[PDB]
Design an enzyme around this catalytic site. Structure first.
Site, PDB file in Angstrom:
ATOM      1  N   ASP A   1     -30.727  65.570  48.310  1.00  0.00           N
ATOM      2  CA  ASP A   1     -31.196  65.944  50.077  1.00  0.00           C
ATOM      3  C   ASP A   1     -31.102  64.383  50.684  1.00  0.00           C
ATOM      4  OD1 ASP A   1     -31.648  67.374  52.254  1.00  0.00           O
ATOM      5  OD2 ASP A   1     -33.805  67.657  51.940  1.00  0.00           O
TER       6      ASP A   1
ATOM      7  N   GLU B   1     -25.114  65.071  47.902  1.00  0.00           N
ATOM      8  CA  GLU B   1     -25.734  64.599  49.030  1.00  0.00           C
ATOM      9  C   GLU B   1     -26.371  63.276  49.351  1.00  0.00           C
ATOM     10  OE1 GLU B   1     -28.972  66.744  52.424  1.00  0.00           O
ATOM     11  OE2 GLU B   1     -27.686  68.127  51.084  1.00  0.00           O
TER      12      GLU B   1
ATOM     13  N   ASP C   1     -23.709  71.523  43.556  1.00  0.00           N
ATOM     14  CA  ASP C   1     -24.155  72.335  44.448  1.00  0.00           C
ATOM     15  C   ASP C   1     -23.172  73.411  45.168  1.00  0.00           C
ATOM     16  OD1 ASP C   1     -25.561  73.738  46.614  1.00  0.00           O
ATOM     17  OD2 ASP C   1     -26.366  71.767  47.432  1.00  0.00           O
TER      18      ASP C   1
HETATM   19 CA    CA Z   1     -29.926  68.829  52.650  1.00  0.00          CA
END
Ligand code: CA
Lengths: 75, 253
Positions: B15, B45, B155
């Site tokens: 994230d 990310e 992901d």
């Molecule tokens: Ca995110």
């Protein structure tokens, strides 16, 4: 049988390295892996099992290897 | 005594697109990594401020990135265990979010690997593009040489019945979670009831993070799958809105 065995390669240097191999996999695959992991060429080292040299074509099954057996390697 | 027949890795969307608590959650992730000390880490990310953290906090991993601008993927290789051979970046032509397939050919335990990660297209509405990327991934896994073992972990952002519509994983490709019997404890990698990072209390959960691997039968054997990043950090938050996945596998010659 979804089965393999554990083989150890022991060096003159005291290092022991474990590998898993199926019983009808040619042992060349294991020799090639050991050379890759340790950064050694076939030309300098040799492999033996219970006293005898190892042909690339021979399987654990044909040499009647068993789980936790040790292959010896010499410079 | 050394065990060449067991490899471990973690895959984890960390994230990077959440700027608040960046230094802290980053340290959290590095500590989770130090605990387990995996041979490979697949990161998604990642932002550039998050890479700099890894250079000196995880200085024992060599780092290979899928890009350099915005947010990208990255694969971390443990110095000494893993021998970098080569590297390749496959584009997703219709990507509207700069996604791509990062491929790293390595040696580990003397075993040839092709390691791949990606962060496939996001959101419910981009399902069509997400499936096209999955087919490219699935596709690239088979192009690889028969000799090498391909592992993909990322992901996927995948949803139920999407794999079913894409046409299903092909014959020589397995899902590590499905292989281990669909264990309950690691069934959700994105869980809003047990995770409060995005701050959306509505109870939606998915298996976004997935491991695929190609290999002849009984030559790559998943041993365990476990969530990581379950540790509430100092701010009260978790390292990410995603749980990471820790996977141990047996390589059999
Ligand atoms: Ca995110």
């Amino acid at each position: 049988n979804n089965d393999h065995i554990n083989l150890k390669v022991a060096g003159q240097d005291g290092s022991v390295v474990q590998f898993k191999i199926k019983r009808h996999t040619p042992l060349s695959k294991l020799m090639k892996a050991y050379c890759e992991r340790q950064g050694l060429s076939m030309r300098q080292i040799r492999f033996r099992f219970d006293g005898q040299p190892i042909n690339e074509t021979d399987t654990p099954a044909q040499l009647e290897m068993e789980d936790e057996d040790t292959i010896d390697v010499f410079q | 005594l050394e065990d060449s027949s067991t490899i471990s890795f973690i895959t984890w969307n960390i994230d990077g697109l959440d700027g608040c608590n960046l230094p802290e959650r980053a340290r959290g992730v590095c500590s989770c990594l130090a605990l387990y000390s995996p041979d490979v880490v697949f990161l998604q990310e990642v932002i550039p401020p998050y890479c700099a953290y890894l250079k000196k906090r995880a200085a024992s991993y060599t780092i290979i990135t899928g890009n350099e601008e915005g947010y990208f993927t990255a694969i971390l290789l443990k110095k000494g265990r893993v021998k970098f051979k080569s590297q390749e970046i496959i584009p997703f032509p219709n990507t509207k979010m700069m996604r791509n397939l990062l491929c790293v050919n390595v040696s580990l335990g003397g075993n040839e690997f092709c390691l791949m990660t990606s962060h496939l297209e996001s959101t419910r509405e981009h399902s069509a593009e997400r499936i096209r990327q999955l087919k490219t991934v699935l596709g690239k896994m088979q192009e690889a040489p028969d000799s090498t073992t391909v592992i993909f972990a990322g992901d996927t952002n995948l949803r139920d019945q999407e794999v079913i519509k894409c046409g299903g994983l092909p014959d020589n490709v397995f899902d590590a979670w499905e292989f281990l019997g669909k264990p309950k404890h690691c069934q959700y990698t994105w869980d809003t009831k047990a995770n409060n990072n995005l701050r959306i209390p509505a109870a939606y959960k998915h298996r976004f993070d997935r491991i695929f691997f190609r290999a002849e039968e009984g030559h790559l054997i998943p041993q365990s799958l476990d969530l990581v990043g379950l540790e509430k950090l100092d701010c009260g938050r978790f390292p990410s809105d995603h749980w990471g996945l820790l996977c141990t596998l047996n390589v059999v010659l």
